[PDB]
């Protein structure tokens, strides 16, 4: 109830504050208010309004599944970052509560969040390498060493989250952002996150999700391995082989391990198989798989292939 009391001073205002304060306010989001977490983004006279205090790039172009992620610039500081626009009516408290206060090089830094009208604007570091999703499309598919390298980094992000009892909930290439030189990958977008003790991408769904079973951190591991397949093949699993209601096929069919490219090294194939066990209790954890994937990268000679480089044909 004292938490409830402190939230009142925050309501109706945009302030520069700390992560815990943003999390507490976000709990009330189920007309301009919020907390900005970096001095690079500054409120003006209790406000932070779109096209007034911050502006989106040029004519508005987006990234993300819904074209909801934009480049933006603080008009006062000149600082450039990314904004994810979320509809207030659909906003999930966990999108901010699960990630406010996190600190890991494997998770994209949260810069703040501001409600304005029917919008929750979530601000974060702009990673100028773009998304791993964009990279797969741009390059066709990724060589084995680079795919293992990014899976490894995603799994390190997952270790950090799972230890803290946070389920990401939608691990996929679109949700992995890259530094300008491609050397650093970080998890982003906690829209589907859950605090342990709402559907992610269907192709990446674990059998226990589709079957309505109780879910734990292992769901992120299955999804990360569907992302691995996406990286190697240039397409999602279940894209070929099945052409109807997809959720049923995930439940009834063997894991999509037949999509592992034959040319992959044995430990790569082994790692993907352990992450794609249908029963969660049999599936590798984030730590186990991260060690296996790190070893697999070493087994193919470490990271050698070019950042960008040459278009490789999708399967």
Swiss-Prot record:
Catalytic residues at: 170 (proton acceptor)
| Mutant lacking the gene: phenotype | Mice display the alymphoplasia phenotype (aly), which is characterized by systemic absence of lymph nodes and Peyer patches and disorganized splenic and thymic structures with immunodeficiency.
Relate the assembly described in the record.
Interacts with TRAF2, TRAF3, TRAF5, TRAF6, IKKA and NF-kappa-B2/P100. Interacts with PELI3. Interacts with NIBP; the interaction is direct. Interacts with ARRB1 and ARRB2. Interacts with GRB10. Interacts with ZFP91. Interacts with NLRP12; this interaction promotes proteasomal degradation of MAP3K14. Directly interacts with DDX3X. Interacts (via C-terminus and kinase domain) with PPPC3A (via N-terminus) and PPP3CB.
Note the residue range shown relative to the complete protein. Answer: 334 to 675 of 942
Cellular localisation: Cytoplasm
Q: Which family does it belong to?
A: Belongs to the protein kinase superfamily. STE Ser/Thr protein kinase family. MAP kinase kinase kinase subfamily.
Q: Which organism is it from?
A: Mus musculus (Mouse)
Descriptive protein name: Mitogen-activated protein kinase kinase kinase 14
Q: Domain named Protein kinase: which ranges?
A: 55-297
Positions of post-translational Phosphothreonine modification: 201
Region of interest called Interaction with ZFP91, as start-end residue ranges on this chain? 56-295
| Functional note | Lymphotoxin beta-activated kinase which seems to be exclusively involved in the activation of NF-kappa-B and its transcriptional activity. Phosphorylates CHUK/IKKA. Promotes proteolytic processing of NFKB2/P100, which leads to activation of NF-kappa-B via the non-canonical pathway. Has an essential role in the non-canonical NF-kappa-B signalining that regulates genes encoding molecules involved in B-cell survival, lymphoid organogenesis, and immune response. Could act in a receptor-selective manner.
Q: Which residues bind ATP?
A: 61-69, 84
Q: Show the stretches that span the lipid bilayer.
A: none
UniProt modification remark: Phosphorylation at Thr-201 is required to activate its kinase activity and 'Lys-63'-linked polyubiquitination. Phosphorylated by CHUK/IKKA leading to MAP3K14 destabilization. Autophosphorylated.
């Amino acid at each position: 109830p004292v938490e409830e009391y402190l939230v009142h001073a925050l309501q109706g205002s945009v302030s520069s504050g700390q992560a815990h304060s943003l999390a507490s306010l976000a709990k009330t989001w189920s007309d301009n208010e919020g907390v900005l977490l970096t001095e690079k983004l500054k409120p003006v006279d209790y406000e932070y309004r779109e096209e007034v205090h911050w502006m989106t790039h040029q004519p508005r172009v987006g990234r993300g599944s819904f074209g909801e992620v934009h480049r933006m610039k603080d008009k006062q500081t000149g600082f450039q970052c990314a904004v994810k626009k979320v509809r207030l009516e659909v906003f999930r408290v966990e999108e901010l509560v699960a990630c406010a206060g996190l600190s890991s090089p494997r998770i994209v830094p949260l810069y703040g969040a501001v409600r304005e009208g029917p919008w929750v604007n979530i601000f974060m570091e702009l990673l100028e390498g773009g998304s791993l999703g964009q990279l797969i499309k741009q390059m066709g598919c990724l060589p084995e060493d680079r795919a293992l390298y990014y899976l490894g980094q995603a799994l390190e992000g997952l270790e950090y989250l799972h230890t803290r009892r946070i389920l990401h909930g939608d691990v996929k290439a679109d949700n992995v952002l890259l530094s300008s030189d491609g050397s650093r990958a970080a998890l982003c977008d906690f829209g589907h996150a859950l605090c342990l003790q709402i559907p992610g991408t269907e192709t990446h769904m674990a059998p226990e999700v589709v079957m309505g079973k109780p879910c734990d951190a292992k769901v992120d591991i299955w999804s990360s391995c569907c992302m691995m397949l996406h990286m190697l093949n240039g397409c999602h699993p279940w894209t070929q082989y099945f052409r109807g209601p997809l959720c049923l096929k995930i439940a009834s069919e063997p894991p999509p391990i037949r999509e592992i490219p034959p040319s992959c090294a044995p430990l790569t194939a082994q790692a993907i198989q352990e992450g794609l066990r249908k029963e969660p209790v049999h599936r590798a954890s984030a730590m186990e798989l991260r060690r296996k994937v790190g070893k697999a990268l070493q087994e193919v000679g470490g990271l050698k292939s070019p950042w960008k480089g040459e278009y490789k044909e999708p399967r």
